[PDB]
């Protein structure tokens, strides 16, 4: 039953930078683990944006400490390119890096040999199997899976998802760590999408299908799922936000393995924006251009 | 180019009563048609309800005006059990009956032959082709859907629908009393489920076969959802707040229509639970158990 306080997020991405933010922001010593220093410098420049944002809204009254705040916070998060050495002594490995099976098992095959022998494993992927991932290395009984939230500063909720190999202690400690996040931990079974993907992703594939189907424009999808069904963002709007390049892996992924369910059937517009590397609001540029 | 001033509600369930409420709410006169006094007795009730609810917050620190708002908008609304008494002299007809094309086109077929020359007939339809509708009748250039979405008193959102036939003049009309409604009028096309449905129950339905599946229970699901992806509703809270048979009777209609497409496949828990009356928060059950 181990007490997570050193914890290393790999990936710099819209996750990674997210999920290193808030364990920092709550007091946890991090290590930021990513391919370059310029990934690196990007990603804690874009964490200190972040904060700020809190800040100048949290501490308008007493500015000095809202610097101690952003400072103290990026101060408990360093960087590194060399996960092997890191994780030789961590408490939780989070890997959120590409979503893609063969890489992340690559991945921690390689860091089970490296990583100390409490160290437990977790994958924030969005629609792999955590099982799947867990049997890459040896140390099933402390893999499991640990899904956040886009952007990770302001959804609350946290999937902890175990294998039939988790352990009950790998999962409590994950759930503890969870609520010192200051998160909202919800256990689910290790299938495809786990909850909130399995639904969403096919609905904005949906939505991407109605606009190829010529039924209607982006923008008055988008008005009509915030003005209609009260969402805070369109369907257009969101898959910009999230990826374009992740969700296209989501749905390859799944329609390689059940290629005759219509729901995850490739979009031509899709893979032409990714295959053009037009991502959303990562690369500047989606199903809307962005300044 | 016709100014709707006197307009009939057709149906006091949870659309008709709100659209009857809020073009009474902002100066139209009204008659609200339904099966038996009771019903409408009942319908009144909840539009008192409503109100109040609007002017405990649009009024909030003025409960005179509260008062007079509530007063005022309910004796604006008058009632009938028989809309053909009424619509010989109306500007507007809102048809919001239950989700049966041979029901609605006999209505509409009937109300053809008592109302005015220039009367405009408007269908709430949620899954049916407006085309389809009008074909009951002759008038079809001053036929058109004008969808809401429930609640009506707060979602901003109305879609004006027209067919190959509706007139510019029909049109025009019909996006001025939206504005005039206080609404945000969205031309859409006439396509199955329009926008906000055909993506919006295709995701409810998954949501259902999530949980028949075993994968999740209904209450982790709705949790997921909200605190996941920002909904203001879980899948299961908005489906009884929509309506389960009218939900199960759109995906009757979209699976009868194309059978082969299995995200219309009824579902044996919706179709269980609307065998046994239980519609959900209008009947006081549906997938949960109300007051
Ligand atoms: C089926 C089809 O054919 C088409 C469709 O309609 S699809 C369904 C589309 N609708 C949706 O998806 C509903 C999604 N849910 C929502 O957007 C929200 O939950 C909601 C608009 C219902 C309000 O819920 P909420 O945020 O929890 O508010 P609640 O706690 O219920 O009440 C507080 C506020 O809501 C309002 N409210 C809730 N129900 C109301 C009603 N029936 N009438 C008037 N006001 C109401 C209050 O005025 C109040 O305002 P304040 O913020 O100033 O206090
Ligand atoms: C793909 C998978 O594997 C799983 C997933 O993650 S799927 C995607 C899940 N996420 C969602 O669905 C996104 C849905 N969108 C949302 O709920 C909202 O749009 C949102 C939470 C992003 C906020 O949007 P918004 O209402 O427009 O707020 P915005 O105007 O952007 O900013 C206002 C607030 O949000 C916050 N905010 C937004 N982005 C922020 C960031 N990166 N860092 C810190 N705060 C941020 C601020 O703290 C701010 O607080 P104040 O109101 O006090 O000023
Ligand atoms: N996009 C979202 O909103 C969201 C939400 C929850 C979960 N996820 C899942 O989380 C993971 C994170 O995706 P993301 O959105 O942050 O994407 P991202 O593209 O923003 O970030 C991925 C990061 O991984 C790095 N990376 C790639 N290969 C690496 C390797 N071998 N070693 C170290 N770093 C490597 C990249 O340089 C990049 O910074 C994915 O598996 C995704 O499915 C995404
Ligand atoms: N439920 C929703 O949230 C929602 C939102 C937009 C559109 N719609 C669509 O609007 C219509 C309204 O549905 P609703 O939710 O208000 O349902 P509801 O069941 O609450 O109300 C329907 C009302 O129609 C009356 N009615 C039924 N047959 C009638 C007839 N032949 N003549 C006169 N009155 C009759 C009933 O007595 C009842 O009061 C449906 O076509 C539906 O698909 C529903």
Same mark, same amino acid.
């Given at each position: 039953?181990?007490?997570?306080?050193?914890?290393?997020?790999?990936?710099?991405?819209?996750?990674?930078?997210?999920?290193?933010?808030?364990?920092?922001? /709550?007091?946890?010593?991090?290590?930021?683990?990513?391919? /370059? %220093?310029?990934?690196?410098?990007?990603?804690?420049?874009?964490? %200190? %944006?972040?904060?700020?944002? !809190?800040?100048?809204?949290?501490?308008? +009254?007493?500015?000095?400490?809202?610097? %101690?705040?952003?400072?103290?916070?990026?101060?408990?998060?360093?960087?590194?390119? =060399?996960?092997?050495? $890191?994780?030789?002594?961590?408490?939780?490995? $989070?890997?959120?890096?590409?979503?893609?099976?063969? !890489?992340?098992?690559?991945?921690?095959?390689?860091?089970?040999?490296?990583?100390? +022998?409490?160290?437990?494993?977790?994958?924030?992927?969005?629609?792999?199997?955590?099982?799947?991932?867990?049997?890459?290395?040896?140390?099933?009984?402390? @893999?499991?899976?640990?899904? @956040?939230?886009?952007?990770?500063?302001?959804?609350?909720?946290?999937?902890?998802?175990?294998?039939?190999? /988790?352990?009950?202690?790998?999962?409590?400690?994950?759930?503890?760590?969870?609520?010192?996040?200051?998160?909202?931990?919800?256990?689910?079974? =290790?299938? *495809?999408?786990?909850?909130?993907?399995?639904?969403? !992703?096919?609905?904005?594939?949906?939505?991407?299908?109605?606009?190829?189907? &010529?039924?209607?424009?982006?923008?008055?999808?988008?008005?009509?799922?915030?003005?209609?069904?009260?969402?805070?963002?369109?369907? @257009?709007?969101?898959?910009?936000? !999230? &990826?374009?390049?992740?969700?296209?892996?989501?749905?390859?992924?799944?329609?390689?393995?059940?290629?005759?369910?219509?729901?995850?059937?490739?979009? *031509?517009?899709?893979?032409?924006?990714?295959?053009?590397?037009?991502?959303?609001?990562?690369?500047? +540029?989606?199903?809307?251009?962005?300044?």
């Amino acid at each position: 039953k181990i007490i997570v306080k050193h914890v290393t997020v790999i990936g710099g991405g819209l996750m990674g930078a997210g999920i290193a933010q808030v364990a920092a922001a /709550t007091g946890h010593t991090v290590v930021l683990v990513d391919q /370059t %220093e310029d990934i690196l410098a990007k990603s804690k420049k874009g964490i %200190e %944006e972040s904060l700020r944002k !809190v800040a100048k809204k949290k501490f308008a +009254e007493n500015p000095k400490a809202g610097d %101690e705040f952003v400072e103290k916070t990026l101060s408990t998060i360093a960087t590194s390119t =060399d996960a092997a050495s $890191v994780v030789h002594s961590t408490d939780l490995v $989070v890997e959120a890096i590409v979503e893609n099976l063969k !890489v992340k098992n690559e991945l921690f095959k390689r860091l089970d040999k490296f990583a100390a +022998e409490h160290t437990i494993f977790a994958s924030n992927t969005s629609s792999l199997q955590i099982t799947s991932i867990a049997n890459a290395t040896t140390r099933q009984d402390r @893999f499991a899976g640990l899904h @956040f939230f886009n952007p990770v500063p302001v959804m609350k909720l946290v999937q902890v998802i175990k294998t039939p190999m /988790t352990s009950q202690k790998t999962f409590e400690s994950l759930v503890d760590f969870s609520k010192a996040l200051g998160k909202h931990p919800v256990s689910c079974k =290790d299938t *495809p999408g786990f909850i909130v993907n399995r639904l969403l !992703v096919p609905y904005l594939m949906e939505a991407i299908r109605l606009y190829e189907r &010529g039924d209607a424009s982006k923008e008055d999808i988008d008005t009509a799922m915030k003005l209609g069904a009260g969402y805070p963002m369109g369907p @257009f709007e969101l898959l910009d936000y !999230v &990826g374009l390049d992740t969700t296209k892996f989501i749905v390859d992924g799944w329609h390689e393995m059940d290629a005759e369910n219509p729901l995850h059937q490739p979009s *031509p517009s899709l893979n032409k924006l990714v295959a053009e590397n037009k991502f959303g609001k990562k690369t500047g +540029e989606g199903f809307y251009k962005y300044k």
